[PDB]
């Protein structure tokens, strides 16, 4: 994967005005992430959750179902963010399963990548890896797979950097 700086005026989830985009972000983003979306506020249908994850739960399934079935959304963005306290470090006791299992699996699957980095750079890699795995996982969902095979859905990953005040697409 590579990180491509977004140009606000040419984001792949806004090829035309006036549509809604399902924006999946993290509860501790704590800054101006939507100012890097390339979308006006009225085009954003926002689901903001622990770790910008979609897990096997009623909320994640109903939100996706409402977006595709009621709003006819054709674009989903999973936005992670540098400095995340949830997709960080090696443990957090107050984070329940399956969120904690997703991060355990990231850390074990990508151990050699993570072990090659230190401290803040490692946490930045874990943010990026979480976005990539959430995008891949969401495409394998039955509801997304059907819409993808009909060419009625795209799922995009990006990471927001509150220090550079920019978003970066995962390509």
What is the binding site for a second copy (CB under 8 A)?
27-32, 41-50, 55, 57-63, 65-66, 68-71, 86, 92-96, 98-99
Q: How far apart are CA 42 and CA 39, in angstroms?
A: 8
Q: Does 155 bind Zn ion (CB under 5 A)?
A: no
Q: How far apart are CA 5 and CA 156, in angstroms?
A: 14
Q: Does 26 bind Zn ion (CB under 5 A)?
A: yes
Q: Which is nearer to Zn ion, 41 or 142 (CB)?
A: 41
Q: How far apart are CA 54 and CA 49, in angstroms?
A: 8
Q: Which is nearer to a second copy, 94 or 119 (CB)?
A: 94
Chain positions 73 to 92 lying near Zn ion, rule: CB under 5 A, are 84, 86
Distances (CA, A) of 97 to 56, 92, 147: 10, 11, 28
Q: Which is nearer to a second copy, 40 or 115 (CB)?
A: 40
Q: CA Rg, the chain, in Å?
A: 15
Q: Which is nearer to Zn ion, 16 or 119 (CB)?
A: 119
Among Zn ion, a second copy, none, residue 93 binds (CB under 5-8 Å by kind): a second copy
Q: Which residues are CB-contacts of 13 (< 8 A; sequence separation ≥ 6)?
A: 21, 38, 39, 75, 76, 77, 154, 156
Kindly state the smallest distance separating residue 83's Cβ from Zn ion, in Å. Answer: 8
């Amino acid at each position: 994967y590579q990180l491509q700086p977004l140009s606000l005026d040419s984001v792949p989830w806004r090829r035309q005005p006036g549509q809604q985009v399902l924006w999946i972000g993290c509860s501790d983003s704590g800054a101006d992430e939507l100012e890097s979306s390339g979308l006006p506020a009225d085009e954003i249908f926002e689901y903001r959750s622990l770790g910008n994850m979609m897990v096997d739960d009623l909320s994640c399934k109903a939100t996706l179902g409402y977006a595709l079935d009621s709003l006819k959304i054709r674009n989903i963005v999973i936005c992670g963010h540098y400095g995340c306290h949830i997709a960080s470090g090696e443990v957090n006791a107050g984070l329940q399963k399956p969120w904690s299992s997703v991060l355990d699996t990231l850390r074990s699957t990508h151990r050699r990548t993570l072990d090659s980095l230190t401290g803040t750079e490692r946490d930045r890699a874990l943010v990026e890896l979480n976005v990539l795995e959430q995008v891949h996982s969401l495409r394998q969902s039955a509801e997304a797979a059907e819409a993808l095979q009909k060419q009625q859905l795209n799922i995009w990953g990006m990471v927001y950097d509150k220090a550079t005040k920019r978003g970066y697409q995962l390509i």
